[PDB]
Amino acid sequence: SGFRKMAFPSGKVEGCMVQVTCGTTTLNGLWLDDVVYCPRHVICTNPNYEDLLIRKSNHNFLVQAGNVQLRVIGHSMQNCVLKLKVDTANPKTPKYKFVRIQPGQTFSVLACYNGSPSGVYQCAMRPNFTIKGSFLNGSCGSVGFNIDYDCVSFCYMHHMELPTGVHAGTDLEGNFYGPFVDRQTAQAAGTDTTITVNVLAWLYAAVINGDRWFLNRFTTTLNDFNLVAMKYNYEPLTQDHVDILGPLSAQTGIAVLDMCASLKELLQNGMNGRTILGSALLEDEFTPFDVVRQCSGVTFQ
Amino acid sequence: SGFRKMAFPSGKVEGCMVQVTCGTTTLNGLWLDDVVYCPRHVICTNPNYEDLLIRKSNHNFLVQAGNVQLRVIGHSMQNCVLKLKVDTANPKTPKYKFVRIQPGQTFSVLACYNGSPSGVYQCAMRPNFTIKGSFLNGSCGSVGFNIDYDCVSFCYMHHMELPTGVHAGTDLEGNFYGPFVDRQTAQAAGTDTTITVNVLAWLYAAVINGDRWFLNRFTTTLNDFNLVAMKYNYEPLTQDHVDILGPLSAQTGIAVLDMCASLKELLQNGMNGRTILGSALLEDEFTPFDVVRQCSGVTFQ
Ligand SMILES: *[C@H](O)[C@H](C[C@@H]1CCNC1=O)NC(=O)[C@H](CC(=C)C)NC(=O)[C@@H](NC(=O)OCc1ccccc1)C(C)C
Ligand SMILES: *[C@H](O)[C@H](C[C@@H]1CCNC1=O)NC(=O)[C@H](CC(=C)C)NC(=O)[C@@H](NC(=O)OCc1ccccc1)C(C)C
């Protein structure tokens, strides 16, 4: 037992991380087959990236795979990412996919500087399409991902930090998550909400792990719960979310709408100096899958 | 900016993980050079491990490195770990050290099942020599570690779960952390305390990240703070801890004893519905080093 915010093993991604330097900007790139993907704002000089890229030549891009130099033999733009064709295919290329995730889903971030991995952590895509990451200057180009057996699904590439200290980025096709642009003009995150289905998943994790103090036999209808959700800035719960929680409900014997009544009481009353899985807040960055994966012990390779 | 519970990149350790099966027990081993290290309780049949090991032969130990089979050519006991000599040296062996950590220090855990990594997370060695991990049956032999540039310092191997759902294990020389034994007789964790120097480090992280609401100009003496610490089951703060916090104090301009006065008030008053770095509790599983590493961006390889 126990419950931790747990990231995927990062080895498969570490082997894809390279350094990309152009002019005076250094950031990280993702080296898959014979292409290096990186944020287009690496390109030199309110910007017009099509302008800036035609003035650029292959030899302007310094790509370093650890120590070995990578010769760039072509370049192109795809939305907000740059694709640098290099003359060597990464021999460590995993089975991979480029997937775009939904708000409320989680992924692991391999934070990198100068092409070298610094640390791994888990987070969620917020309803407002930001992520609450940990990123310093030089971290751009770090990626987020999920692993399913042996396949890496890349879902995020880091581009910027917004004024509230939250982070914004693209999928690996270069399309931003949310209404953000890779310009340094004034932009703001937009109002966020709590990911209700994840909070319920985490309450099931707590029951699986022996925290039961918040349980009751008060029940509720989906409609009556959603009136309470709206009041506390929680996202609406759908019948699909109820279905997705089915397995956890079956494992614990607590009906989904019964757990909703527990959450209603927690929202209206607080926790009264108590904790749930070591937290004094209702945690919303664990998906139902994350809970099942971590309380049945699924592995990868 | 941002602040996350962040683990070391796990690639270097993933390449050392193997599966060890003997009789009907399967668990994980650590493959370094031509030795596989694993918990001695893998051995077949209130146990006497010296008895049990002399009855054992090399061919009883089934060691699997992914798909490739590893031929065991010798075995010996070292305290509570078994050392299985195999006929092949792990070509992925990193630069490594076996270090024993102190209560209050942190490390990354690569949770494994059947020799395959499942996830990575960070935790601390508690003052009572347990760890609050996330471990299910089959996870024994998973290791904890820190990385310093290119060198892996292994500090923990997982052995058991105690009745409160916390975890106990050994260093890589096979010596238990704390007063625990690898028998399934009744054992209990012992009363824990909060790691004061880490809470102060985390408050400095909060200031570095823009949370300042808990600050004040009330100051305190080390002696007067430690009277408050004892009352709230916090560990004593030493002059050495004050020195260790020096750099963070210098970076933020908040004297260590001034931050102690802030912590005094937080302990006596609570947080009054507010949060610090996304938590409604005082967090104690970040060391001063963890804070500096994550707010200056140190990397590894
Ligand atoms: C790439 O390594 C960095 C990573 C960035 C540095 C600190 N934390 C991070 O995640 N990214 C950048 O430097 C980008 C470059 C870009 C093309 C936009 N710039 C930023 O992240 C700035 N953010 C920004 O300009 O957002 C819009 C904005 C909002 C409010 C006022 C002005 C502009 C950031 C460093 C200030
Ligand atoms: C190895 O894969 C497992 C990992 C364990 C399973 C569930 N979570 C874990 O971390 N370890 C064991 O099965 C060990 C074997 C051993 C040599 C002691 N057994 C346990 O972890 C049991 N713990 C235990 O017996 O602790 C002492 C105790 C305390 C109270 C009553 C009786 C015994 C655990 C599975 C019950």
Side-chain angles (χ1 to χ4, degrees):
Chain A
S1 54
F3 204 71
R4 284 263 183 206
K5 199 157 262 182
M6 180 197 297
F8 288 98
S10 60
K12 279 183 226 274
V13 180
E14 298 170 43
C16 304
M17 284 330 285
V18 306
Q19 183 187 256
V20 182
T21 291
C22 186
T24 206
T25 311
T26 289
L27 49 68
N28 307 281
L30 185 74
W31 181 21
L32 302 170
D33 295 326
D34 64 340
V35 178
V36 170
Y37 302 80
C38 74
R40 74 181 173 169
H41 73 252
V42 71
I43 73 191
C44 295
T45 88
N46 192 348
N48 192 7
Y49 288 105
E50 283 94 345
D51 262 339
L52 306 188
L53 182 59
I54 190 64
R55 312 177 182 171
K56 302 285 289 211
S57 39
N58 287 348
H59 63 92
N60 298 137
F61 296 100
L62 281 62
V63 187
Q64 306 201 60
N67 285 317
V68 162
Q69 301 284 128
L70 286 186
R71 170 177 153 62
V72 173
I73 63 181
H75 55 285
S76 53
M77 220 168 60
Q78 207 219 336
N79 302 311
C80 296
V81 294
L82 198 55
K83 296 174 73 143
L84 303 177
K85 211 206 163 103
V86 295
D87 64 357
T88 316
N90 183 3
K92 302 207 244 213
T93 301
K95 183 54 154 53
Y96 73 92
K97 302 198 280 224
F98 287 173
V99 308
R100 189 180 173 91
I101 61 165
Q102 289 288 318
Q105 297 197 259
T106 56
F107 55 101
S108 296
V109 168
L110 180 64
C112 295
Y113 302 89
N114 302 296
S116 295
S118 170
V120 196
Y121 54 86
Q122 192 75 354
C123 53
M125 173 78 42
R126 301 308 308 169
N128 68 1
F129 289 106
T130 68
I131 70 171
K132 307 188 169 147
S134 175
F135 291 119
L136 305 168
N137 191 16
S139 62
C140 286
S142 305
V143 298
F145 61 97
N146 286 118
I147 299 176
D148 40 285
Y149 191 48
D150 56 357
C151 181
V152 179
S153 299
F154 296 101
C155 57
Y156 178 80
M157 184 173 267
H158 187 52
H159 290 244
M160 39 201 300
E161 184 173 298
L162 295 170
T164 53
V166 299
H167 299 105
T170 64
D171 64 24
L172 268 295
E173 307 295 350
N175 300 298
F176 262 91
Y177 289 103
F180 310 107
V181 297
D182 52 351
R183 294 150 222 165
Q184 298 202 150
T185 74
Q187 299 186 62
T191 60
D192 207 19
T193 51
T194 300
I195 308 153
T196 307
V197 63
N198 287 4
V199 174
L200 293 168
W202 172 79
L203 289 175
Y204 279 108
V207 174
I208 293 179
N209 274 96
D211 279 320
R212 312 185 47 91
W213 62 263
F214 51 86
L215 293 182
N216 60 48
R217 280 81 50 220
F218 315 133
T219 189
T220 187
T221 63
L222 188 52
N223 280 347
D224 284 347
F225 174 79
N226 280 307
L227 278 315
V228 173
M230 257 186 247
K231 171 185 163 157
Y232 289 90
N233 193 35
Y234 270 55
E235 289 221 293
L237 197 71
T238 68
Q239 185 59 45
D240 192 37
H241 295 144
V242 170
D243 297 342
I244 284 165
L245 292 165
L248 287 174
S249 188
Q251 177 172 3
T252 61
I254 294 162
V256 175
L257 286 188
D258 289 350
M259 189 73 76
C260 288
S262 287
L263 179 54
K264 176 151 37 83
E265 296 302 317
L266 285 166
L267 287 174
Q268 295 177 351
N269 290 332
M271 306 201 14
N272 186 24
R274 291 169 290 201
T275 58
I276 302 179
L277 287 174
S279 177
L281 302 163
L282 300 168
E283 175 68 44
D284 79 340
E285 292 211 351
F286 293 96
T287 68
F289 173 94
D290 296 347
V291 171
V292 170
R293 147 185 183 222
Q294 189 166 164
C295 304
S296 85
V298 188
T299 45
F300 307 95
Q301 189 59 291
Chain B
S1 54
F3 204 71
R4 284 263 183 206
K5 199 157 262 182
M6 180 197 297
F8 288 98
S10 60
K12 279 183 226 274
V13 180
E14 298 170 43
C16 304
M17 284 330 285
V18 306
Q19 183 187 256
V20 182
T21 291
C22 186
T24 206
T25 311
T26 289
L27 49 68
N28 307 281
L30 185 74
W31 181 21
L32 302 170
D33 295 326
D34 64 340
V35 178
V36 170
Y37 302 80
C38 74
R40 74 181 173 169
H41 73 252
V42 71
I43 73 191
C44 295
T45 88
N46 192 348
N48 192 7
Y49 288 105
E50 283 94 345
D51 262 339
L52 306 188
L53 182 59
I54 190 64
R55 312 177 182 171
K56 302 285 289 211
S57 39
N58 287 348
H59 63 92
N60 298 137
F61 296 100
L62 281 62
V63 187
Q64 306 201 60
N67 285 317
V68 162
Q69 301 284 128
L70 286 186
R71 170 177 153 62
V72 173
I73 63 181
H75 55 285
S76 53
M77 220 168 60
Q78 207 219 336
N79 302 311
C80 296
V81 294
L82 198 55
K83 296 174 73 143
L84 303 177
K85 211 206 163 103
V86 295
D87 64 357
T88 316
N90 183 3
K92 302 207 244 213
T93 301
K95 183 54 154 53
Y96 73 92
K97 302 198 280 224
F98 287 173
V99 308
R100 189 180 173 91
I101 61 165
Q102 289 288 318
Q105 297 197 259
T106 56
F107 55 101
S108 296
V109 168
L110 180 64
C112 295
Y113 302 89
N114 302 296
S116 295
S118 170
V120 196
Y121 54 86
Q122 192 75 354
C123 53
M125 173 78 42
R126 301 308 308 169
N128 68 1
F129 289 106
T130 68
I131 70 171
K132 307 188 169 147
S134 175
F135 291 119
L136 305 168
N137 191 16
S139 62
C140 286
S142 305
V143 298
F145 61 97
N146 286 118
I147 299 176
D148 40 285
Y149 191 48
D150 56 357
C151 181
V152 179
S153 299
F154 296 101
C155 57
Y156 178 80
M157 184 173 267
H158 187 52
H159 290 244
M160 39 201 300
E161 184 173 298
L162 295 170
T164 53
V166 299
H167 299 105
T170 64
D171 64 24
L172 268 295
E173 307 295 350
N175 300 298
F176 262 91
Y177 289 103
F180 310 107
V181 297
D182 52 351
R183 294 150 222 165
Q184 298 202 150
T185 74
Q187 299 186 62
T191 60
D192 207 19
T193 51
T194 300
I195 308 153
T196 307
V197 63
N198 287 4
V199 174
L200 293 168
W202 172 79
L203 289 175
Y204 279 108
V207 174
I208 293 179
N209 274 96
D211 279 320
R212 312 185 47 91
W213 62 263
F214 51 86
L215 293 182
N216 60 48
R217 280 81 50 220
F218 315 133
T219 189
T220 187
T221 63
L222 188 52
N223 280 347
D224 284 347
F225 174 79
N226 280 307
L227 278 315
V228 173
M230 257 186 247
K231 171 185 163 157
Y232 289 90
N233 193 35
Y234 270 55
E235 289 221 293
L237 197 71
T238 68
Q239 185 59 45
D240 192 37
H241 295 144
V242 170
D243 297 342
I244 284 165
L245 292 165
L248 287 174
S249 188
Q251 177 172 3
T252 61
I254 294 162
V256 175
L257 286 188
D258 289 350
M259 189 73 76
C260 288
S262 287
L263 179 54
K264 176 151 37 83
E265 296 302 317
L266 285 166
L267 287 174
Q268 295 177 351
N269 290 332
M271 306 201 14
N272 186 24
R274 291 169 290 201
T275 58
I276 302 179
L277 287 174
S279 177
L281 302 163
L282 300 168
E283 175 68 44
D284 79 340
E285 292 211 351
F286 293 96
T287 68
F289 173 94
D290 296 347
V291 171
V292 170
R293 147 185 183 222
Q294 189 166 164
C295 304
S296 85
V298 188
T299 45
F300 307 95
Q301 189 59 291

PDB file of all heavy atoms in Angstrom, chain A residues 41 135-140 158-161 163 167 182-187, ligand 1:
ATOM      1  N   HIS A  41      10.741  29.015 -31.093  1.00  0.00           N
ATOM      2  CA  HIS A  41      11.301  30.289 -30.670  1.00  0.00           C
ATOM      3  C   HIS A  41      12.795  30.231 -30.449  1.00  0.00           C
ATOM      4  O   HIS A  41      13.372  31.255 -30.077  1.00  0.00           O
ATOM      5  CB  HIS A  41      10.606  30.836 -29.418  1.00  0.00           C
ATOM      6  CG  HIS A  41      10.918  30.125 -28.126  1.00  0.00           C
ATOM      7  ND1 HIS A  41      10.003  29.313 -27.484  1.00  0.00           N
ATOM      8  CD2 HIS A  41      11.991  30.198 -27.299  1.00  0.00           C
ATOM      9  CE1 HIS A  41      10.513  28.889 -26.340  1.00  0.00           C
ATOM     10  NE2 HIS A  41      11.723  29.401 -26.209  1.00  0.00           N
ATOM     11  N   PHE A 135       9.786  24.670 -13.845  1.00  0.00           N
ATOM     12  CA  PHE A 135      10.568  24.977 -15.036  1.00  0.00           C
ATOM     13  C   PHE A 135      11.319  26.280 -14.836  1.00  0.00           C
ATOM     14  O   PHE A 135      10.721  27.280 -14.429  1.00  0.00           O
ATOM     15  CB  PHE A 135       9.676  25.117 -16.261  1.00  0.00           C
ATOM     16  CG  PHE A 135       9.037  23.833 -16.723  1.00  0.00           C
ATOM     17  CD1 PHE A 135       7.657  23.715 -16.753  1.00  0.00           C
ATOM     18  CD2 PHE A 135       9.811  22.795 -17.211  1.00  0.00           C
ATOM     19  CE1 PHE A 135       7.057  22.545 -17.210  1.00  0.00           C
ATOM     20  CE2 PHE A 135       9.223  21.634 -17.692  1.00  0.00           C
ATOM     21  CZ  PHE A 135       7.839  21.527 -17.709  1.00  0.00           C
ATOM     22  N   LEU A 136      12.610  26.268 -15.143  1.00  0.00           N
ATOM     23  CA  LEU A 136      13.446  27.460 -15.092  1.00  0.00           C
ATOM     24  C   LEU A 136      13.930  27.792 -16.496  1.00  0.00           C
ATOM     25  O   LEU A 136      13.748  27.014 -17.433  1.00  0.00           O
ATOM     26  CB  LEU A 136      14.633  27.253 -14.144  1.00  0.00           C
ATOM     27  CG  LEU A 136      14.327  26.823 -12.715  1.00  0.00           C
ATOM     28  CD1 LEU A 136      15.596  26.384 -12.017  1.00  0.00           C
ATOM     29  CD2 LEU A 136      13.654  27.954 -11.930  1.00  0.00           C
ATOM     30  N   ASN A 137      14.560  28.956 -16.649  1.00  0.00           N
ATOM     31  CA  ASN A 137      15.061  29.311 -17.966  1.00  0.00           C
ATOM     32  C   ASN A 137      15.967  28.189 -18.463  1.00  0.00           C
ATOM     33  O   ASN A 137      16.700  27.567 -17.684  1.00  0.00           O
ATOM     34  CB  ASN A 137      15.795  30.653 -17.919  1.00  0.00           C
ATOM     35  CG  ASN A 137      16.109  31.186 -19.302  1.00  0.00           C
ATOM     36  OD1 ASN A 137      15.546  30.727 -20.312  1.00  0.00           O
ATOM     37  ND2 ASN A 137      17.018  32.160 -19.365  1.00  0.00           N
ATOM     38  N   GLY A 138      15.846  27.869 -19.752  1.00  0.00           N
ATOM     39  CA  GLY A 138      16.588  26.781 -20.353  1.00  0.00           C
ATOM     40  C   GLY A 138      15.833  25.472 -20.431  1.00  0.00           C
ATOM     41  O   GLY A 138      16.327  24.520 -21.043  1.00  0.00           O
ATOM     42  N   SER A 139      14.657  25.395 -19.816  1.00  0.00           N
ATOM     43  CA  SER A 139      13.895  24.156 -19.759  1.00  0.00           C
ATOM     44  C   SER A 139      13.030  23.933 -20.987  1.00  0.00           C
ATOM     45  O   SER A 139      12.465  22.842 -21.137  1.00  0.00           O
ATOM     46  CB  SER A 139      12.985  24.175 -18.531  1.00  0.00           C
ATOM     47  OG  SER A 139      12.060  25.229 -18.623  1.00  0.00           O
ATOM     48  N   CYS A 140      12.869  24.949 -21.828  1.00  0.00           N
ATOM     49  CA  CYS A 140      12.028  24.802 -23.010  1.00  0.00           C
ATOM     50  C   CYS A 140      12.486  23.635 -23.864  1.00  0.00           C
ATOM     51  O   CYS A 140      13.677  23.321 -23.945  1.00  0.00           O
ATOM     52  CB  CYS A 140      12.030  26.083 -23.825  1.00  0.00           C
ATOM     53  SG  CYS A 140      11.043  27.311 -22.991  1.00  0.00           S
ATOM     54  N   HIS A 158       7.440  21.823 -23.711  1.00  0.00           N
ATOM     55  CA  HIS A 158       7.372  23.053 -22.925  1.00  0.00           C
ATOM     56  C   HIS A 158       7.832  24.273 -23.710  1.00  0.00           C
ATOM     57  O   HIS A 158       8.893  24.241 -24.334  1.00  0.00           O
ATOM     58  CB  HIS A 158       8.232  22.947 -21.665  1.00  0.00           C
ATOM     59  CG  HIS A 158       8.051  24.123 -20.764  1.00  0.00           C
ATOM     60  ND1 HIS A 158       6.808  24.548 -20.357  1.00  0.00           N
ATOM     61  CD2 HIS A 158       8.944  24.979 -20.208  1.00  0.00           C
ATOM     62  CE1 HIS A 158       6.934  25.638 -19.619  1.00  0.00           C
ATOM     63  NE2 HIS A 158       8.224  25.914 -19.505  1.00  0.00           N
ATOM     64  N   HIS A 159       7.066  25.376 -23.596  1.00  0.00           N
ATOM     65  CA  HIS A 159       7.424  26.628 -24.281  1.00  0.00           C
ATOM     66  C   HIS A 159       7.522  27.847 -23.375  1.00  0.00           C
ATOM     67  O   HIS A 159       8.377  28.700 -23.635  1.00  0.00           O
ATOM     68  CB  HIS A 159       6.404  26.976 -25.402  1.00  0.00           C
ATOM     69  CG  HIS A 159       6.457  26.060 -26.581  1.00  0.00           C
ATOM     70  ND1 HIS A 159       6.809  26.486 -27.850  1.00  0.00           N
ATOM     71  CD2 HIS A 159       6.134  24.747 -26.701  1.00  0.00           C
ATOM     72  CE1 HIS A 159       6.738  25.463 -28.687  1.00  0.00           C
ATOM     73  NE2 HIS A 159       6.319  24.401 -28.018  1.00  0.00           N
ATOM     74  N   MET A 160       6.625  28.029 -22.396  1.00  0.00           N
ATOM     75  CA  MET A 160       6.634  29.332 -21.716  1.00  0.00           C
ATOM     76  C   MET A 160       6.080  29.252 -20.301  1.00  0.00           C
ATOM     77  O   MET A 160       5.364  28.316 -19.935  1.00  0.00           O
ATOM     78  CB  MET A 160       5.753  30.386 -22.373  1.00  0.00           C
ATOM     79  CG  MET A 160       4.479  29.838 -22.884  1.00  0.00           C
ATOM     80  SD  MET A 160       3.775  30.925 -24.141  1.00  0.00           S
ATOM     81  CE  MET A 160       3.553  32.434 -23.206  1.00  0.00           C
ATOM     82  N   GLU A 161       6.317  30.334 -19.552  1.00  0.00           N
ATOM     83  CA  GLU A 161       5.766  30.514 -18.217  1.00  0.00           C
ATOM     84  C   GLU A 161       4.873  31.744 -18.198  1.00  0.00           C
ATOM     85  O   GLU A 161       5.277  32.818 -18.667  1.00  0.00           O
ATOM     86  CB  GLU A 161       6.863  30.654 -17.155  1.00  0.00           C
ATOM     87  CG  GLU A 161       6.279  30.735 -15.762  1.00  0.00           C
ATOM     88  CD  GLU A 161       7.333  30.699 -14.675  1.00  0.00           C
ATOM     89  OE1 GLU A 161       8.048  29.689 -14.573  1.00  0.00           O
ATOM     90  OE2 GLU A 161       7.464  31.701 -13.944  1.00  0.00           O
ATOM     91  N   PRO A 163       2.234  34.574 -16.084  1.00  0.00           N
ATOM     92  CA  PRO A 163       2.570  35.423 -14.928  1.00  0.00           C
ATOM     93  C   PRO A 163       2.231  34.826 -13.571  1.00  0.00           C
ATOM     94  O   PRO A 163       2.861  35.215 -12.578  1.00  0.00           O
ATOM     95  CB  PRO A 163       1.770  36.707 -15.192  1.00  0.00           C
ATOM     96  CG  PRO A 163       1.478  36.702 -16.654  1.00  0.00           C
ATOM     97  CD  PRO A 163       1.318  35.263 -17.019  1.00  0.00           C
ATOM     98  N   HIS A 167       2.470  27.098 -16.490  1.00  0.00           N
ATOM     99  CA  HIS A 167       3.252  26.799 -17.679  1.00  0.00           C
ATOM    100  C   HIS A 167       2.360  26.447 -18.855  1.00  0.00           C
ATOM    101  O   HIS A 167       1.271  25.904 -18.690  1.00  0.00           O
ATOM    102  CB  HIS A 167       4.221  25.674 -17.359  1.00  0.00           C
ATOM    103  CG  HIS A 167       5.169  26.055 -16.268  1.00  0.00           C
ATOM    104  ND1 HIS A 167       5.079  25.587 -14.972  1.00  0.00           N
ATOM    105  CD2 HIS A 167       6.139  27.004 -16.262  1.00  0.00           C
ATOM    106  CE1 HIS A 167       6.020  26.162 -14.239  1.00  0.00           C
ATOM    107  NE2 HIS A 167       6.663  27.041 -14.992  1.00  0.00           N
ATOM    108  N   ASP A 182       3.322  31.806 -28.722  1.00  0.00           N
ATOM    109  CA  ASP A 182       4.727  31.890 -28.322  1.00  0.00           C
ATOM    110  C   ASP A 182       5.301  33.268 -28.652  1.00  0.00           C
ATOM    111  O   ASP A 182       6.326  33.418 -29.326  1.00  0.00           O
ATOM    112  CB  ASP A 182       5.549  30.754 -28.929  1.00  0.00           C
ATOM    113  CG  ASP A 182       5.381  30.608 -30.441  1.00  0.00           C
ATOM    114  OD1 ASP A 182       4.510  31.251 -31.066  1.00  0.00           O
ATOM    115  OD2 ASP A 182       6.173  29.826 -31.007  1.00  0.00           O
ATOM    116  N   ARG A 183       4.598  34.282 -28.155  1.00  0.00           N
ATOM    117  CA  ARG A 183       5.069  35.660 -28.140  1.00  0.00           C
ATOM    118  C   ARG A 183       5.187  36.118 -26.694  1.00  0.00           C
ATOM    119  O   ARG A 183       4.413  35.695 -25.829  1.00  0.00           O
ATOM    120  CB  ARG A 183       4.118  36.630 -28.862  1.00  0.00           C
ATOM    121  CG  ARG A 183       3.962  36.457 -30.352  1.00  0.00           C
ATOM    122  CD  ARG A 183       2.550  36.911 -30.733  1.00  0.00           C
ATOM    123  NE  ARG A 183       1.894  36.032 -31.693  1.00  0.00           N
ATOM    124  CZ  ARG A 183       0.592  36.046 -31.948  1.00  0.00           C
ATOM    125  NH1 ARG A 183      -0.220  36.910 -31.354  1.00  0.00           N
ATOM    126  NH2 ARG A 183       0.088  35.162 -32.810  1.00  0.00           N
ATOM    127  N   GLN A 184       6.126  37.023 -26.436  1.00  0.00           N
ATOM    128  CA  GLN A 184       6.255  37.591 -25.096  1.00  0.00           C
ATOM    129  C   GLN A 184       5.425  38.842 -24.891  1.00  0.00           C
ATOM    130  O   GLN A 184       5.865  39.808 -24.267  1.00  0.00           O
ATOM    131  CB  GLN A 184       7.722  37.849 -24.786  1.00  0.00           C
ATOM    132  CG  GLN A 184       8.546  36.557 -24.798  1.00  0.00           C
ATOM    133  CD  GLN A 184       9.831  36.681 -24.014  1.00  0.00           C
ATOM    134  OE1 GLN A 184      10.327  35.699 -23.451  1.00  0.00           O
ATOM    135  NE2 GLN A 184      10.391  37.888 -23.979  1.00  0.00           N
ATOM    136  N   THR A 185       4.203  38.848 -25.397  1.00  0.00           N
ATOM    137  CA  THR A 185       3.192  39.841 -25.074  1.00  0.00           C
ATOM    138  C   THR A 185       2.334  39.349 -23.924  1.00  0.00           C
ATOM    139  O   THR A 185       2.357  38.172 -23.582  1.00  0.00           O
ATOM    140  CB  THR A 185       2.308  40.090 -26.301  1.00  0.00           C
ATOM    141  OG1 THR A 185       1.397  38.993 -26.524  1.00  0.00           O
ATOM    142  CG2 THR A 185       3.192  40.236 -27.533  1.00  0.00           C
ATOM    143  N   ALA A 186       1.549  40.257 -23.352  1.00  0.00           N
ATOM    144  CA  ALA A 186       0.840  39.951 -22.120  1.00  0.00           C
ATOM    145  C   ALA A 186      -0.251  38.924 -22.371  1.00  0.00           C
ATOM    146  O   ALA A 186      -1.112  39.120 -23.230  1.00  0.00           O
ATOM    147  CB  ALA A 186       0.239  41.220 -21.541  1.00  0.00           C
ATOM    148  N   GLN A 187      -0.198  37.822 -21.620  1.00  0.00           N
ATOM    149  CA  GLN A 187      -1.109  36.686 -21.726  1.00  0.00           C
ATOM    150  C   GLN A 187      -1.413  36.226 -20.308  1.00  0.00           C
ATOM    151  O   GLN A 187      -0.560  36.343 -19.424  1.00  0.00           O
ATOM    152  CB  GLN A 187      -0.453  35.533 -22.480  1.00  0.00           C
ATOM    153  CG  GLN A 187      -0.049  35.855 -23.888  1.00  0.00           C
ATOM    154  CD  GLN A 187       0.462  34.640 -24.630  1.00  0.00           C
ATOM    155  OE1 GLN A 187      -0.261  33.663 -24.831  1.00  0.00           O
ATOM    156  NE2 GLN A 187       1.749  34.670 -24.979  1.00  0.00           N
TER     157      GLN A 187
HETATM  158  C1  LIG C   1      12.645  28.178 -22.734  1.00  0.00           C
HETATM  159  O1  LIG C   1      13.827  27.572 -22.179  1.00  0.00           O
HETATM  160  C2  LIG C   1      12.001  29.170 -21.768  1.00  0.00           C
HETATM  161  C3  LIG C   1      11.426  28.425 -20.567  1.00  0.00           C
HETATM  162  C4  LIG C   1      10.878  29.449 -19.590  1.00  0.00           C
HETATM  163  C5  LIG C   1      11.990  30.227 -18.900  1.00  0.00           C
HETATM  164  C6  LIG C   1      11.550  30.339 -17.440  1.00  0.00           C
HETATM  165  N1  LIG C   1      10.553  29.297 -17.279  1.00  0.00           N
HETATM  166  C7  LIG C   1      10.184  28.760 -18.446  1.00  0.00           C
HETATM  167  O2  LIG C   1       9.397  27.853 -18.591  1.00  0.00           O
HETATM  168  N2  LIG C   1      10.924  29.902 -22.437  1.00  0.00           N
HETATM  169  C8  LIG C   1      11.021  31.199 -22.749  1.00  0.00           C
HETATM  170  O3  LIG C   1      11.996  31.874 -22.433  1.00  0.00           O
HETATM  171  C9  LIG C   1       9.872  31.851 -23.487  1.00  0.00           C
HETATM  172  C10 LIG C   1      10.246  32.234 -24.931  1.00  0.00           C
HETATM  173  C11 LIG C   1       9.031  32.449 -25.832  1.00  0.00           C
HETATM  174  C12 LIG C   1       9.095  32.119 -27.108  1.00  0.00           C
HETATM  175  C13 LIG C   1       7.731  33.026 -25.350  1.00  0.00           C
HETATM  176  N3  LIG C   1       9.494  33.053 -22.771  1.00  0.00           N
HETATM  177  C14 LIG C   1       8.818  32.944 -21.630  1.00  0.00           C
HETATM  178  O4  LIG C   1       8.539  31.860 -21.149  1.00  0.00           O
HETATM  179  C15 LIG C   1       8.380  34.217 -20.970  1.00  0.00           C
HETATM  180  N4  LIG C   1       6.936  34.234 -20.979  1.00  0.00           N
HETATM  181  C16 LIG C   1       6.230  35.071 -21.728  1.00  0.00           C
HETATM  182  O5  LIG C   1       6.722  35.985 -22.393  1.00  0.00           O
HETATM  183  O6  LIG C   1       4.791  34.864 -21.721  1.00  0.00           O
HETATM  184  C17 LIG C   1       3.941  35.894 -22.225  1.00  0.00           C
HETATM  185  C18 LIG C   1       3.980  37.145 -21.371  1.00  0.00           C
HETATM  186  C19 LIG C   1       3.172  37.252 -20.238  1.00  0.00           C
HETATM  187  C20 LIG C   1       3.220  38.422 -19.480  1.00  0.00           C
HETATM  188  C21 LIG C   1       4.057  39.473 -19.845  1.00  0.00           C
HETATM  189  C22 LIG C   1       4.858  39.368 -20.977  1.00  0.00           C
HETATM  190  C23 LIG C   1       4.812  38.207 -21.738  1.00  0.00           C
HETATM  191  C24 LIG C   1       8.876  34.294 -19.526  1.00  0.00           C
HETATM  192  C25 LIG C   1      10.349  33.906 -19.426  1.00  0.00           C
HETATM  193  C26 LIG C   1       8.635  35.675 -18.922  1.00  0.00           C
END
